[PDB]
Amino acid sequence: SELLVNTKSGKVMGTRVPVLSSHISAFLGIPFAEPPVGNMRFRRPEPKKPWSGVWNASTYPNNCQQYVDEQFPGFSGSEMWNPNREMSEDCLYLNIWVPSPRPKSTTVMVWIYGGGFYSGSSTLDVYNGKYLAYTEEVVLVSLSYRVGAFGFLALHGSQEAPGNVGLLDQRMALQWVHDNIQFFGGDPKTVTIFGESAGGASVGMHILSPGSRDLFRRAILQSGSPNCPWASVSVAEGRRRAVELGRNLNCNLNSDEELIHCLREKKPQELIDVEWNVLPFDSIFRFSFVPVIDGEFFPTSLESMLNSGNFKKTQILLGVNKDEGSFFLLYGAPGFSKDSESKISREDFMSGVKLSVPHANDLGLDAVTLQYTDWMDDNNGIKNRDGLDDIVGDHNVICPLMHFVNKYTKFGNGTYLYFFNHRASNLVWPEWMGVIHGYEIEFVFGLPLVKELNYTAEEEALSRRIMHYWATFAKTGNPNESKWPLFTTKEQKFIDLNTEPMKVHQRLRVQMCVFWNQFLPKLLNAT
Amino acid sequence: SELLVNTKSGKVMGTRVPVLSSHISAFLGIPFAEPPVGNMRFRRPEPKKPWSGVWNASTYPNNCQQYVDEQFPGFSGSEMWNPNREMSEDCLYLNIWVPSPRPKSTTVMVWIYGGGFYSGSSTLDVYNGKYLAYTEEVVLVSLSYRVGAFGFLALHGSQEAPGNVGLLDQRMALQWVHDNIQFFGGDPKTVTIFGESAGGASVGMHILSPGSRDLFRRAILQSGSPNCPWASVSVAEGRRRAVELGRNLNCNLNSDEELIHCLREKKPQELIDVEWNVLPFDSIFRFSFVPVIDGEFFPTSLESMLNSGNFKKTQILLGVNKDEGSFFLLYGAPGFSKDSESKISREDFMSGVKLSVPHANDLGLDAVTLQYTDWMDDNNGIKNRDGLDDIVGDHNVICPLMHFVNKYTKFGNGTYLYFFNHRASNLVWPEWMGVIHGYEIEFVFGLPLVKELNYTAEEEALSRRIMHYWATFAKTGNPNESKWPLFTTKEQKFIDLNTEPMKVHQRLRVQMCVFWNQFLPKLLNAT
Ligand SMILES: C[N+](C)(C)CCCCCCCCCC[N+](C)(C)C
Ligand SMILES: C[N+](C)(C)CCCCCCCCCC[N+](C)(C)C
């Protein structure tokens, strides 16, 4: 009946969820792989054997085991993104929000959430799919994927904990969407995978892996590229980090199989607890367990792939927002504090840049400084603050994205790039942080439609323009039905996406992105 | 009588020269050393044995042998600075312009002319001392010094052609000024040596050499520092260049004494002719025979001296003008032409920067480009033009000067720094060149007082403000009798010197001078 569909796995009973002045049918919690518990820890996802009877998809699923942030307890700003259902190793499920009436076959959008590859959840409130589904008539599915040690440990030649198992969890959720979205009214021939931060970086990874390209149509990447420094380690480094974690649990490190066993016997939180004492340096915006470029999955280095066009060739929509840096600076660079108007000193500035470009040599730090300091007022505390805010942002999201944009527009079927720079009116974070990495999401998912949560009317509107551009891109292959230009390697146009009449501009962070994407590398290459 | 003074060398008969509505006494051509002809070529200056009878100092002296510029014949812009009396190896003389009435004892200013150490003359019309002497009542002496191969050849251990003989010619003219200016009304206890380009760079050299410090009071350096890349070679390089020149004359290069002999037998123009085929690279703003840092004269590297305060400690007045680069670019960088509005291409730009930073490695050129290009419009022909104009200027005069300013203000008795940026109204050079290296001189020497040569009234005035600041500094030790701040290593003030109400500003070319004076060196040091 409307809330009871039959899929190749079995029947599933969903629910009606109100949305604005109406309803939608929601199927929360459909399983798609087997609970990777115990022995299966660190193994690739197995597909979920089909069921009898009707499965009750009316409750969001457990969240995955992950790091919970207690830096600013109760503060909604932090809590927003913390997991909200009990964490469980068993956590591989989907959530689908369909219209009522169930459409015949409509556009589908799959949201891969981000969170540095160490956290994240489907069930967050800011990832509530009902508003988008409802307003644009699309089906929306959110997926879960294993994050962290559990999702990205990577003892290379050991089939017991090869890398990227969490990446495959994404791919398996994509396949089930393919094979069964049809019974939900969706059109498998037009599914768009979207995602922010590590989700937007996972999205591009699937555009590059041979095996995933076929499972989706087009993609939308938000503040992420597969090539962002923090999203990938070499094989070696992944080994390196798993003996190091091996040591923080006092595991047997002889027989590699024993490493795997030892960890497979520790309880989840132990691993969560020592999860960060394994990184190799003092660094801000750098995470411990991430995708390894293993050869399988990613045939070869992403630079080669990018360089040769070896990747899916659809059109994409991607963008960056004004203050990417802030969050990391706040939570990790000395001098910054929520509550202060964090004017940095030149002392803490030079401390700051080291945390930001952790791999740079001294000469390299010199180059960075020279680029980001205002010599004409070399200690203006606030300028020092904002300058680090750009050093982290540029180096960690804007520049790697403009790289991917630039390489992929030579072989893809169209690129739409946005620059978001609106500060929501009801943000709880301090003004200095600006347009934080993460705050565009709430607009994309329609929370400014809910009156109860106090946004301003122009934000309601900005949220509608966005959701439209998004859904309209998700089918048409293009975002406008004024015209948002295509990005092109000549006069590289993009638009600002805010509450004022969109304006096309050209060459995003060009001067700085030359430094980061070309200069620095060549300098660190020499010496 | 007024035109016939008696000096420790003998008597000298000068002349009355009109100046404005009056006269002055002029003593042109007094000898101060022995004509360094033939056998004495390349030897140190001998002092001039005294004479009997009265010497007739009423005619300017011969000019020194040197390179004459025929790039734009007849064009006054070029011709201005070309030698105007027959060139002669015999060319060591002074010119003194005294008031009428002869003062008892007044301030003295000695003008050491510049010209890249390969050219220059006392007798130029733009170096006519009468207007300054007249208006400010100072005695003004101009000196000649041997330039070029003849002045700076440098077969290190050979007393027959040790280096810097031309530098010593300056010093000997300083001594005679010391010992005899008194009979001309000047006060030996208050002589200021001033000079532009290589003169302003020679001036600072004397502030550093042990032996010259005592011969003058204070100094004024215009577009020059002793430490400008082009003003000094190592001992080695000076050797290197003299065998190379040895070869262009097909000299015997075995016995070093034979090298010296061979050259001592070639006629002057042969040496002038091959004078440039000895430099070691393709470069703009770099000259062949220059001061060697030989240990004697300059005890040690100038960086040490600067670094330790080992130098005379008076107050100085120095400055730079807006478009230093232009002249060299015009005469030596591809794309530029008098007559064109020289918009450069990115092709000729990258050719340009190589000529400008001839010692840089590729990475280094990369660094320069990154700093001087507008990535947001990376091929705007005019921006490429002006950007090279700053690369040459900064690297060759502004930055080395701000270095010397900064080091010397920690131990000197006061520093007054100006930035000249007025375009004379009657300049003959094309507008693109702007405030050319060299054009402030005409203001300092009072040519805007002469109506016949068409300047505008505000320029007349600017010329008077200047001549005053200059003479007033030459006695007082300070330029103003509104107040032009002292330069200080904190809020490094300077003023613009132009036809509008002078404004103090701070930190001249600070962002760029960090790159050149600190960044680059460290990068070229690593690799
Ligand atoms: C990306 N979204 C917007 C979805 C969530 C980001 C939440 C704050 C991000 C910075 C904190 C990094 C913390 C790492 N530790 C706690 C280990 C310092
Ligand atoms: C400095 N002052 C203003 C006094 C005279 C400079 C005259 C033009 C300077 C640039 C030409 C360099 C030429 C070198 N060669 C001819 C060898 C290319």
Short mmCIF file of N, CA, C and O in Angstrom, two decimals, chain B residues 419-476:
data_model
loop_
_atom_site.label_atom_id
_atom_site.label_comp_id
_atom_site.label_asym_id
_atom_site.label_seq_id
_atom_site.Cartn_x
_atom_site.Cartn_y
_atom_site.Cartn_z
N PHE B 419 61.05 59.63 -1.10
CA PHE B 419 60.60 58.82 -2.21
C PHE B 419 60.22 59.83 -3.24
O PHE B 419 59.24 60.50 -2.95
N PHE B 420 60.92 59.97 -4.37
CA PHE B 420 60.57 61.02 -5.37
C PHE B 420 59.67 60.39 -6.38
O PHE B 420 59.89 59.28 -6.82
N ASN B 421 58.66 61.13 -6.78
CA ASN B 421 57.69 60.58 -7.68
C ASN B 421 56.98 61.66 -8.44
O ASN B 421 55.77 61.71 -8.53
N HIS B 422 57.75 62.57 -8.98
CA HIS B 422 57.16 63.63 -9.76
C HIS B 422 57.64 63.40 -11.17
O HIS B 422 58.82 63.13 -11.41
N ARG B 423 56.75 63.54 -12.13
CA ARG B 423 57.16 63.37 -13.52
C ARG B 423 57.45 64.73 -14.08
O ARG B 423 56.50 65.51 -14.18
N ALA B 424 58.67 65.08 -14.47
CA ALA B 424 58.69 66.47 -14.96
C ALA B 424 57.78 66.64 -16.19
O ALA B 424 57.62 65.75 -17.02
N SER B 425 57.24 67.88 -16.31
CA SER B 425 56.29 68.21 -17.38
C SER B 425 56.87 68.26 -18.75
O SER B 425 56.14 68.15 -19.72
N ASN B 426 58.16 68.48 -18.81
CA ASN B 426 58.84 68.58 -20.08
C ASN B 426 59.75 67.40 -20.33
O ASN B 426 60.75 67.58 -21.02
N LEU B 427 59.42 66.21 -19.76
CA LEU B 427 60.33 65.08 -19.96
C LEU B 427 60.30 64.68 -21.45
O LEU B 427 59.25 64.82 -22.06
N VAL B 428 61.40 64.19 -22.04
CA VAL B 428 61.30 63.77 -23.43
C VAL B 428 61.04 62.29 -23.59
O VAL B 428 60.74 61.76 -24.63
N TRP B 429 61.25 61.57 -22.52
CA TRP B 429 61.04 60.14 -22.56
C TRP B 429 59.52 59.89 -22.56
O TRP B 429 58.75 60.76 -22.16
N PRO B 430 59.12 58.67 -23.01
CA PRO B 430 57.73 58.31 -23.08
C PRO B 430 57.21 58.09 -21.70
O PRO B 430 57.84 57.49 -20.84
N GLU B 431 55.98 58.51 -21.55
CA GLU B 431 55.22 58.42 -20.31
C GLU B 431 55.29 57.12 -19.60
O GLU B 431 55.23 57.08 -18.38
N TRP B 432 55.39 56.04 -20.40
CA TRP B 432 55.37 54.76 -19.70
C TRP B 432 56.52 54.61 -18.73
O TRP B 432 56.39 53.92 -17.73
N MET B 433 57.64 55.24 -19.07
CA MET B 433 58.81 55.11 -18.21
C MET B 433 58.60 55.77 -16.83
O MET B 433 59.22 55.42 -15.84
N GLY B 434 57.69 56.76 -16.80
CA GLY B 434 57.39 57.43 -15.55
C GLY B 434 58.55 58.29 -15.02
O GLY B 434 59.23 59.04 -15.72
N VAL B 435 58.70 58.18 -13.69
CA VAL B 435 59.73 58.88 -12.93
C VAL B 435 60.97 58.00 -13.02
O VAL B 435 61.24 57.06 -12.28
N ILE B 436 61.71 58.37 -14.02
CA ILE B 436 62.88 57.64 -14.34
C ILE B 436 64.03 57.82 -13.38
O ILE B 436 64.32 58.82 -12.74
N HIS B 437 64.78 56.76 -13.39
CA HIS B 437 65.95 56.76 -12.59
C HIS B 437 66.84 57.86 -13.11
O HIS B 437 67.43 57.70 -14.15
N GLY B 438 66.92 58.99 -12.43
CA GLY B 438 67.85 59.97 -12.94
C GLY B 438 67.27 61.30 -13.07
O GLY B 438 67.99 62.31 -13.08
N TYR B 439 65.94 61.31 -13.07
CA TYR B 439 65.34 62.60 -13.32
C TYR B 439 65.15 63.55 -12.11
O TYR B 439 64.69 64.69 -12.20
N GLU B 440 65.54 63.08 -10.92
CA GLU B 440 65.41 63.96 -9.75
C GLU B 440 66.56 64.95 -9.73
O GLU B 440 66.45 66.11 -9.34
N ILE B 441 67.70 64.43 -10.18
CA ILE B 441 68.90 65.25 -10.29
C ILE B 441 68.60 66.67 -10.78
O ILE B 441 68.95 67.65 -10.14
N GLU B 442 67.89 66.81 -11.92
CA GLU B 442 67.67 68.15 -12.46
C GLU B 442 67.00 69.14 -11.53
O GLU B 442 67.09 70.36 -11.72
N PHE B 443 66.30 68.55 -10.56
CA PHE B 443 65.60 69.36 -9.58
C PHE B 443 66.57 69.73 -8.52
O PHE B 443 66.62 70.85 -8.09
N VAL B 444 67.37 68.76 -8.10
CA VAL B 444 68.36 69.06 -7.07
C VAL B 444 69.32 70.12 -7.53
O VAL B 444 69.74 70.94 -6.76
N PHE B 445 69.69 70.12 -8.78
CA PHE B 445 70.66 71.11 -9.24
C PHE B 445 70.07 72.40 -9.80
O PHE B 445 70.71 73.11 -10.56
N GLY B 446 68.83 72.72 -9.47
CA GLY B 446 68.23 73.98 -9.93
C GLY B 446 67.94 74.30 -11.41
O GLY B 446 67.92 75.47 -11.84
N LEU B 447 67.70 73.27 -12.23
CA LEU B 447 67.42 73.66 -13.62
C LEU B 447 66.04 74.22 -13.79
O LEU B 447 65.86 75.07 -14.65
N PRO B 448 65.03 73.79 -13.00
CA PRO B 448 63.77 74.52 -13.04
C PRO B 448 63.76 76.01 -12.67
O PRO B 448 62.68 76.57 -12.47
N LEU B 449 64.94 76.63 -12.48
CA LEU B 449 64.98 78.08 -12.17
C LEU B 449 65.18 78.80 -13.47
O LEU B 449 64.77 79.93 -13.62
N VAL B 450 65.83 78.13 -14.40
CA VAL B 450 66.06 78.69 -15.72
C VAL B 450 64.70 78.67 -16.51
O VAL B 450 64.13 77.64 -16.85
N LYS B 451 64.21 79.86 -16.86
CA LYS B 451 62.92 79.92 -17.57
C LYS B 451 62.94 79.38 -19.02
O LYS B 451 62.01 78.78 -19.58
N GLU B 452 64.11 79.64 -19.59
CA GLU B 452 64.38 79.27 -20.96
C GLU B 452 64.12 77.82 -21.21
O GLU B 452 63.71 77.49 -22.30
N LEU B 453 64.36 76.96 -20.23
CA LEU B 453 64.15 75.54 -20.50
C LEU B 453 62.78 74.95 -20.14
O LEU B 453 62.61 73.77 -19.86
N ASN B 454 61.80 75.84 -20.15
CA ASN B 454 60.40 75.46 -19.96
C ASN B 454 59.99 74.46 -18.89
O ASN B 454 59.61 73.35 -19.25
N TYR B 455 60.04 74.81 -17.61
CA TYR B 455 59.51 73.84 -16.64
C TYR B 455 58.25 74.54 -16.18
O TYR B 455 57.99 75.63 -16.66
N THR B 456 57.44 73.97 -15.29
CA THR B 456 56.24 74.72 -14.89
C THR B 456 56.57 75.38 -13.61
O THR B 456 57.46 74.88 -12.94
N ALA B 457 55.82 76.40 -13.22
CA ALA B 457 56.13 77.06 -11.96
C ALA B 457 56.13 76.18 -10.74
O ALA B 457 56.94 76.36 -9.83
N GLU B 458 55.21 75.22 -10.68
CA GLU B 458 55.27 74.41 -9.46
C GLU B 458 56.58 73.59 -9.43
O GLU B 458 57.05 73.20 -8.38
N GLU B 459 57.15 73.29 -10.60
CA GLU B 459 58.41 72.56 -10.61
C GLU B 459 59.53 73.47 -10.12
O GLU B 459 60.45 73.03 -9.43
N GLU B 460 59.44 74.77 -10.48
CA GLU B 460 60.44 75.74 -10.01
C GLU B 460 60.40 75.63 -8.49
O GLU B 460 61.37 75.41 -7.80
N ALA B 461 59.20 75.74 -7.98
CA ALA B 461 59.08 75.63 -6.56
C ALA B 461 59.59 74.31 -5.98
O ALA B 461 60.24 74.32 -4.95
N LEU B 462 59.27 73.19 -6.61
CA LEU B 462 59.69 71.90 -6.07
C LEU B 462 61.19 71.82 -6.02
O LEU B 462 61.76 71.22 -5.11
N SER B 463 61.82 72.45 -7.05
CA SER B 463 63.27 72.51 -7.15
C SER B 463 63.78 73.37 -6.02
O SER B 463 64.81 73.11 -5.44
N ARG B 464 63.08 74.44 -5.67
CA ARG B 464 63.65 75.21 -4.55
C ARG B 464 63.53 74.45 -3.22
O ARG B 464 64.48 74.46 -2.45
N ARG B 465 62.36 73.80 -2.98
CA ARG B 465 62.17 73.04 -1.74
C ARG B 465 63.27 72.02 -1.65
O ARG B 465 63.84 71.79 -0.60
N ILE B 466 63.53 71.36 -2.76
CA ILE B 466 64.57 70.35 -2.75
C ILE B 466 65.92 70.96 -2.42
O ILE B 466 66.52 70.59 -1.42
N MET B 467 66.40 71.91 -3.28
CA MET B 467 67.74 72.47 -3.04
C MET B 467 67.91 72.91 -1.61
O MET B 467 69.00 72.82 -1.08
N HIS B 468 66.83 73.42 -1.02
CA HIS B 468 66.91 73.86 0.35
C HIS B 468 67.11 72.67 1.27
O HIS B 468 68.07 72.57 2.01
N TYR B 469 66.17 71.72 1.21
CA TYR B 469 66.28 70.53 2.06
C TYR B 469 67.68 69.93 2.02
O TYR B 469 68.23 69.44 3.00
N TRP B 470 68.24 69.98 0.82
CA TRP B 470 69.53 69.47 0.57
C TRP B 470 70.58 70.29 1.27
O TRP B 470 71.31 69.74 2.09
N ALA B 471 70.67 71.60 0.96
CA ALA B 471 71.70 72.43 1.58
C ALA B 471 71.44 72.52 3.02
O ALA B 471 72.33 72.32 3.80
N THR B 472 70.21 72.79 3.40
CA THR B 472 69.95 72.79 4.84
C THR B 472 70.37 71.47 5.49
O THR B 472 70.89 71.45 6.60
N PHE B 473 70.19 70.33 4.84
CA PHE B 473 70.70 69.13 5.49
C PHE B 473 72.26 69.13 5.54
O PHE B 473 72.90 68.73 6.51
N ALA B 474 72.86 69.59 4.46
CA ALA B 474 74.32 69.59 4.34
C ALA B 474 75.08 70.31 5.45
O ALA B 474 76.31 70.19 5.53
N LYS B 475 74.37 71.11 6.28
CA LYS B 475 75.03 71.82 7.38
C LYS B 475 74.42 71.42 8.65
O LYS B 475 75.01 70.90 9.58
N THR B 476 73.16 71.63 8.72
CA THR B 476 72.53 71.27 9.92
C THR B 476 72.60 69.79 10.27
O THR B 476 72.51 69.43 11.44
#
